[PDB]
Amino acid sequence: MKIVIAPDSFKESLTAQQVAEAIKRGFQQSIADVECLLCPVGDGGEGTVDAIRHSLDLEEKCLQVTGSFGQKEVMRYFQKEQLALFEVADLVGLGKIPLEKRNPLQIQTRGIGELIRHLISQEIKEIYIGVGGTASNDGGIGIAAGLGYQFYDEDGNALPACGQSLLNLASVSTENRYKIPEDVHIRILADVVSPLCGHQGATYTFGKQKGLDSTMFEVVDQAIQDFYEKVSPATLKLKGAGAGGGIAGGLCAFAQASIVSGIDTCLDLIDFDKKVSDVDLVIVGEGRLDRQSLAGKAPIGVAKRTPVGVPVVAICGSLVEDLPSLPFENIQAAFSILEKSEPLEDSLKNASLYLEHTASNIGHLLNMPKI
Amino acid sequence: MKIVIAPDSFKESLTAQQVAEAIKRGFQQSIADVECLLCPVGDGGEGTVDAIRHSLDLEEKCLQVTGSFGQKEVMRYFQKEQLALFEVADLVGLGKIPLEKRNPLQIQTRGIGELIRHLISQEIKEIYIGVGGTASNDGGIGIAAGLGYQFYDEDGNALPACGQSLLNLASVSTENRYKIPEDVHIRILADVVSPLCGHQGATYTFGKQKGLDSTMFEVVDQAIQDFYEKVSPATLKLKGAGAGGGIAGGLCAFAQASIVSGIDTCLDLIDFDKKVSDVDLVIVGEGRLDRQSLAGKAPIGVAKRTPVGVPVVAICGSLVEDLPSLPFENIQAAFSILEKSEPLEDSLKNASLYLEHTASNIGHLLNMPKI
């Protein structure tokens, strides 16, 4: 019996790789003679790159680039031939910026632009960018500045490249703008269709979680709009241009990048379609399983690509009550790993162990005879 | 496919019968040809008699007895063939007395004695009594005062019958002591091993859980110990005698009652053995499957009685961390119905929907062809 374990990561608890391994123990502990293929995935959220890295041989490289606060910092990315990959969070990620230094309007992102230029010079044709888990809200101006663009206010001053400056933006020079070769494809793995500006835009949707008082929302969101009205108004219509506090947009208007399905892309990169060829069972999952995760998130993404006749089972951190009755399509069952009423932070902490227990219990049920 | 659903009750949530019906539903929607036999069980806790009545025909009878505050109350008991069962909770039960009048030392339990005498006068030889979920803490004097014993204070006045009088108890007259026929057997179904006194006795273990304040712990506990030292010293050694604020002790001391395994006794009454003689799956479970009291729990008891070769799946409200590795004591799998992190109060209310979903998910895993 071959089981393909393709879980997403558990937000604030475990990487997809850790989830997959915990599930594998449970099954090895309960089903004799069983092949468990680990195939951790991602839907575009932070960690999605590390997941792909487990199914695709890549080489880790580093590059000294401008950090989130000016000083030179080393950024990472992964290559394989003319293919490269990297997470924008590896530079300006929230998970590496202590709260004492959290002003989404002070953070710099140009370093991302620099990374791209070096990749092109290195003869790289396919650049997959992960966005998300970011702590910045600069509508993307950093990517612009990082690609040539220069800004000025009501006075011909340099104007520091940061979100805060978008407030005092007037003059804009698009002279020495870096040109991306037409044979180079940049793709942003998206996990959300949030637009640049608006109530559902980047500033209103993710501004609070990353140190921005609601008062500045209505103002900053406005400055971001004017900025694009001048340089690239067509970007204001792009679906997921809001991801990364506007970084996704900056990448579309200045790096000619396009935003694609985070999960579908990930699945193609790791050869999921081949890995599930002639398989008995497929395990799916994520931290919270809701109506949306069954709409276009990792879980359903994996299920949709599973051969006909192959049962799919979900093992999640938790299930919301607004879930459709199962089986849902090919998803035959869905389990929550929670074991007892306890604080949330204790569940997240024992998730690995809980995951194993659930895999074992499920295993035992499968080992059960038939009468 | 024959299934026997033998769950215990889910304290402060559902009766064993309700739990079983919810589980049944889940299986009737996930398994094509399911034959579900509901067999609710109890281990002595409040609700046990009710579970028994679903598998054993008993005529419901009433009796005008002395209530918990003096006035006349109508207690209930159930008789079959020379046999009778009743729960002490039906008179002094916690789930039958609001906190407005909640004063554990002011509650009178002589009504239980009254009922027992009536049972004997009805020529009943087998009496099974459940002691659980009580609201009183009188060490059991109420049982004695209900069986003939009389008490007097420091100067010689007839002291009222309640925990409080234990504090002014000066002397006890054993004259009008009611004599229990030698052909009468009063057995107590207890789910606790708590002794009468001490730091793990009736007062200290369950006194505050409802009523008594911590400041009066020593006074009441010592006052109770003095009472037995004067009338029934050995009873102070009986395990479980602490059940029901001491009522289990009183019964043993003044009614020549014995303390038996609640769950095991219950399985015999409902005729569980034959019910599962040729079945394929037995479902068990309770509100909280814990280790500190693992051995003794209703679930494991029901399990160890399931025939050889018959898989047992436990479905519980929650599971403690110290649970042994599966399988253990016939239990092949142990699920928690929990779906998400939420206050215990919400899980208790949704308990019914959760059980249905968990049984549903289990059935689907059972319908999957084996390899």
Tab-separated table of all heavy atoms in Angstrom, chain A residues 137-161:
chain	number	residue	atom	x	y	z
A	137	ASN	N	4.866	47.494	3.840
A	137	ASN	CA	3.667	48.017	3.207
A	137	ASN	C	4.128	49.242	2.440
A	137	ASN	O	3.787	50.369	2.788
A	137	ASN	CB	2.615	48.418	4.242
A	137	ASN	CG	1.239	48.622	3.622
A	137	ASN	OD1	1.065	49.425	2.707
A	137	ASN	ND2	0.255	47.892	4.123
A	138	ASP	N	4.927	49.013	1.403
A	138	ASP	CA	5.451	50.099	0.585
A	138	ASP	C	4.855	50.067	-0.825
A	138	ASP	O	5.469	50.557	-1.775
A	138	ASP	CB	6.975	49.993	0.496
A	138	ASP	CG	7.426	48.856	-0.397
A	138	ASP	OD1	6.696	47.849	-0.491
A	138	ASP	OD2	8.513	48.952	-1.000
A	139	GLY	N	3.668	49.485	-0.956
A	139	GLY	CA	3.019	49.409	-2.253
A	139	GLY	C	3.887	48.930	-3.409
A	139	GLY	O	3.434	48.906	-4.551
A	140	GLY	N	5.131	48.556	-3.130
A	140	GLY	CA	6.012	48.087	-4.185
A	140	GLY	C	7.066	49.062	-4.691
A	140	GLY	O	7.882	48.693	-5.537
A	141	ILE	N	7.079	50.292	-4.183
A	141	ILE	CA	8.062	51.268	-4.645
A	141	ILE	C	9.501	50.780	-4.517
A	141	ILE	O	10.370	51.193	-5.281
A	141	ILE	CB	7.925	52.636	-3.907
A	141	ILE	CG1	7.874	52.436	-2.387
A	141	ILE	CG2	6.692	53.363	-4.383
A	141	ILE	CD1	9.236	52.290	-1.726
A	142	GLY	N	9.752	49.896	-3.559
A	142	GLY	CA	11.102	49.394	-3.375
A	142	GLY	C	11.586	48.608	-4.580
A	142	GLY	O	12.761	48.663	-4.951
A	143	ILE	N	10.670	47.869	-5.194
A	143	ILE	CA	11.004	47.066	-6.357
A	143	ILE	C	11.343	47.993	-7.507
A	143	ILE	O	12.232	47.705	-8.324
A	143	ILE	CB	9.834	46.169	-6.742
A	143	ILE	CG1	9.389	45.390	-5.515
A	143	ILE	CG2	10.251	45.187	-7.819
A	143	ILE	CD1	10.491	44.536	-4.929
A	144	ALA	N	10.625	49.112	-7.554
A	144	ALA	CA	10.829	50.134	-8.577
A	144	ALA	C	12.216	50.733	-8.374
A	144	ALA	O	13.095	50.613	-9.241
A	144	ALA	CB	9.764	51.219	-8.446
A	145	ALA	N	12.415	51.368	-7.221
A	145	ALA	CA	13.704	51.967	-6.909
A	145	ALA	C	14.792	50.928	-7.151
A	145	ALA	O	15.830	51.234	-7.717
A	145	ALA	CB	13.727	52.430	-5.461
A	146	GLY	N	14.537	49.693	-6.736
A	146	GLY	CA	15.516	48.642	-6.923
A	146	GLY	C	15.747	48.274	-8.374
A	146	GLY	O	16.642	47.488	-8.679
A	147	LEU	N	14.948	48.830	-9.279
A	147	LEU	CA	15.107	48.523	-10.701
A	147	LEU	C	15.462	49.734	-11.573
A	147	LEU	O	15.457	49.642	-12.804
A	147	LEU	CB	13.843	47.846	-11.236
A	147	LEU	CG	13.605	46.395	-10.799
A	147	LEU	CD1	12.278	45.916	-11.348
A	147	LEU	CD2	14.735	45.508	-11.281
A	148	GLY	N	15.768	50.861	-10.933
A	148	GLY	CA	16.142	52.057	-11.669
A	148	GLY	C	15.375	53.306	-11.283
A	148	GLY	O	15.961	54.369	-11.063
A	149	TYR	N	14.057	53.175	-11.198
A	149	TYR	CA	13.185	54.294	-10.855
A	149	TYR	C	13.683	55.147	-9.683
A	149	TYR	O	14.215	54.631	-8.697
A	149	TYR	CB	11.769	53.776	-10.569
A	149	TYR	CG	11.081	53.147	-11.770
A	149	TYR	CD1	11.587	51.995	-12.376
A	149	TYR	CD2	9.925	53.714	-12.307
A	149	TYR	CE1	10.959	51.422	-13.491
A	149	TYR	CE2	9.291	53.152	-13.419
A	149	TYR	CZ	9.811	52.009	-14.007
A	149	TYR	OH	9.186	51.465	-15.110
A	150	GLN	N	13.512	56.460	-9.809
A	150	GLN	CA	13.928	57.401	-8.772
A	150	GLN	C	12.744	58.291	-8.438
A	150	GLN	O	11.971	58.664	-9.323
A	150	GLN	CB	15.098	58.238	-9.265
A	150	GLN	CG	16.161	57.401	-9.928
A	150	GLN	CD	17.425	58.178	-10.190
A	150	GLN	OE1	17.380	59.323	-10.646
A	150	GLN	NE2	18.566	57.558	-9.915
A	151	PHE	N	12.604	58.637	-7.162
A	151	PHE	CA	11.471	59.447	-6.730
A	151	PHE	C	11.837	60.798	-6.115
A	151	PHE	O	12.933	60.982	-5.587
A	151	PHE	CB	10.619	58.650	-5.733
A	151	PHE	CG	10.437	57.197	-6.102
A	151	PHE	CD1	11.493	56.291	-5.971
A	151	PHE	CD2	9.209	56.731	-6.572
A	151	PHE	CE1	11.332	54.944	-6.298
A	151	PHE	CE2	9.037	55.383	-6.904
A	151	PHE	CZ	10.101	54.489	-6.767
A	152	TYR	N	10.899	61.738	-6.196
A	152	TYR	CA	11.073	63.082	-5.655
A	152	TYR	C	9.723	63.585	-5.139
A	152	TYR	O	8.666	63.170	-5.621
A	152	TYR	CB	11.599	64.043	-6.731
A	152	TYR	CG	12.703	63.475	-7.600
A	152	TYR	CD1	12.407	62.664	-8.696
A	152	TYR	CD2	14.042	63.724	-7.314
A	152	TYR	CE1	13.418	62.116	-9.486
A	152	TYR	CE2	15.061	63.180	-8.096
A	152	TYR	CZ	14.741	62.377	-9.178
A	152	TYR	OH	15.741	61.828	-9.945
A	153	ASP	N	9.765	64.475	-4.156
A	153	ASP	CA	8.551	65.036	-3.568
A	153	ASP	C	8.193	66.382	-4.202
A	153	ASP	O	8.511	66.629	-5.365
A	153	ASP	CB	8.744	65.210	-2.063
A	153	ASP	CG	10.007	65.982	-1.724
A	153	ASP	OD1	11.112	65.479	-2.029
A	153	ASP	OD2	9.894	67.089	-1.157
A	154	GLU	N	7.530	67.244	-3.430
A	154	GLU	CA	7.132	68.572	-3.902
A	154	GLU	C	8.366	69.442	-4.125
A	154	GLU	O	8.273	70.566	-4.617
A	154	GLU	CB	6.196	69.241	-2.885
A	154	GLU	CG	4.802	68.623	-2.809
A	154	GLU	CD	3.987	68.852	-4.073
A	154	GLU	OE1	3.702	70.027	-4.397
A	154	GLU	OE2	3.630	67.855	-4.740
A	155	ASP	N	9.519	68.898	-3.745
A	155	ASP	CA	10.810	69.557	-3.896
A	155	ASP	C	11.725	68.488	-4.499
A	155	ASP	O	11.575	67.302	-4.205
A	155	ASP	CB	11.351	70.002	-2.529
A	155	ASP	CG	12.447	71.050	-2.645
A	155	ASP	OD1	13.428	70.821	-3.390
A	155	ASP	OD2	12.333	72.099	-1.972
A	156	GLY	N	12.664	68.903	-5.342
A	156	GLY	CA	13.561	67.950	-5.973
A	156	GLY	C	14.538	67.247	-5.054
A	156	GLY	O	15.750	67.318	-5.261
A	157	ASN	N	14.027	66.565	-4.036
A	157	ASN	CA	14.896	65.847	-3.115
A	157	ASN	C	14.877	64.362	-3.465
A	157	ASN	O	13.989	63.894	-4.181
A	157	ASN	CB	14.440	66.063	-1.672
A	157	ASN	CG	14.258	67.536	-1.332
A	157	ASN	OD1	15.160	68.353	-1.537
A	157	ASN	ND2	13.084	67.882	-0.812
A	158	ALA	N	15.870	63.634	-2.964
A	158	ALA	CA	16.008	62.205	-3.229
A	158	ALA	C	14.825	61.359	-2.765
A	158	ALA	O	14.478	60.371	-3.413
A	158	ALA	CB	17.295	61.686	-2.590
A	159	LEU	N	14.208	61.744	-1.650
A	159	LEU	CA	13.081	60.990	-1.104
A	159	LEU	C	13.485	59.539	-0.841
A	159	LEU	O	13.622	58.743	-1.769
A	159	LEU	CB	11.882	61.027	-2.061
A	159	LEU	CG	10.774	62.034	-1.736
A	159	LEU	CD1	9.558	61.769	-2.608
A	159	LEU	CD2	10.389	61.900	-0.272
A	160	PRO	N	13.677	59.174	0.438
A	160	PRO	CA	14.070	57.808	0.797
A	160	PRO	C	13.096	56.750	0.276
A	160	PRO	O	11.883	56.881	0.432
A	160	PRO	CB	14.123	57.857	2.325
A	160	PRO	CG	13.089	58.886	2.664
A	160	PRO	CD	13.373	59.962	1.645
A	161	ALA	N	13.634	55.705	-0.343
A	161	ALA	CA	12.802	54.638	-0.876
A	161	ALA	C	12.187	53.804	0.247
A	161	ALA	O	12.811	52.882	0.768
A	161	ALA	CB	13.617	53.754	-1.801
